[PDB]
Write a protein that binds this ligand. Sequence first.
Ligand code: GTP
Ligand code: SFG
Length: 295
Amino acid sequence: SPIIKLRNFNNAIKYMLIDKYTRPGDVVLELGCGKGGDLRKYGAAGISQFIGIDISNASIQEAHKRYRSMRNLDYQVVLITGDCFGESLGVAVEPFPDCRFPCDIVSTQFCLHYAFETEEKARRALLNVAKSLKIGGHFFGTIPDSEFIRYKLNKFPKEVEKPSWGNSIYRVTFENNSYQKNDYEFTSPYGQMYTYWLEDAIDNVPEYVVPFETLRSLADEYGLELVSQMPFNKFFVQEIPKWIERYSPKMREGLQRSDGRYGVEGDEKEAASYFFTMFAFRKVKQYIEPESVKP
Ligand SMILES: Nc1nc2c(ncn2[C@@H]2O[C@H](COP(=O)(O)OP(=O)(O)OP(=O)(O)O)[C@@H](O)[C@H]2O)c(=O)[nH]1
Ligand SMILES: Nc1ncnc2c1ncn2[C@@H]1O[C@H](C[C@@H](N)CC[C@H](N)C(=O)O)[C@@H](O)[C@H]1O
C-alpha cells in the first residue's frame, strides 16, 4: 500500500527531527498537536513536560482519552483547546498554570501553513513561538516545500485557470492562476491558497503556501535564526545512518523499498519526500516591539 509507506516515512522523519533537537528534561510546546500522534516520540527524548494546543476540541478529547492508554508516561501532559495563530498564546495558556514557560522546544508538525492565510496571522504565530522560547531554544517543524511548489507552478501556461498536479495518493489544486499571470511570482507572500488532497488523511482542505524566504525573514524580525532547512528526501539520507540500528524489524520493513534499500519509491517519493521540507530555528534574541519603550 503506497499511502502506508508514506505514513511510515513521515513518522520516521518526525523521529529523526524530534530526537535531533530535543534533550532530556525539556519542556515541549506542540502547536497544532492534533490527536497526540507524536507523544511516543518525545518519550524517547526523555522530556519533562509536553504542552499540546489544537483549535479542534474533538481532537484534544481524543488526545486526552489516549494518553491514558499508553505505558512509559514519565512526563506531565497539558492539552489545550486554543487558536495558536489567530490569537495571543497567553489567552490559551492562562487557565493552565502548570505550564512551564519559557520552554525549550516549539514544534509545528504539518500545520504552520494554516497560519499563512494572512500577514496578521503569520506574524502572531511567529511572535507566539518567539515569546514562548528560552534563548537557545529551538523551533522546528515540517511544511510543504515552497521550492517544490514553485518548481511545479512554473511549468503551467498562463491559460490554465486552476493549476493542478498530483498522483494516485495526493493532489494539489490552486485557487487561481495569479502566479502565472504575474510572471511566475506570487503577488503576495500570504493568502496563496491551494486545496490539498491526501488519500485517507486530508479531504480537499484549503492550505497556504509558505514562501520559505518570508518565513525566514519574519522569524528573524522576532529573534529566531535559521539553523537547518532540508527537504524530506535530503534530510532522510543524511540521518538514516544513525537510525537503522534503532528501528525494530517491522519498522525496518515499512521503510524499505522492494530492493531492500531504505527510502521511498513510486507515488510516495513525490508525495512525501519531495513535497515537504523540515526546518529548525534557534532563538538568539529577546524581541522588543518597536516604539514600545515609554518613559
Ligand atoms: N500538506 C499537509 N499534509 C498533512 C497535514 N496533516 C497531515 N498531513 C500528512 O498526512 C500524513 C498521514 O496522516 P495520518 O494518516 O492521519 O497519520 P497518523 O495519524 O500518524 O497515522 P499512522 O502513521 O498510521 O500512525 C502525514 O504523514 C502528513 O504527511 C496537513 O495539514 N497538511
Ligand atoms: N489556528 C490553529 N491553532 C491550532 N491548531 C490549529 C490551527 N489551525 C489548524 N490547527 C490544527 O492543526 C492540525 C493539523 C494536522 N495536519 C497536524 C496534526 C499533527 N501535528 C500531525 O503531525 O499530523 C489540526 O489538528 C488542526 O485542527
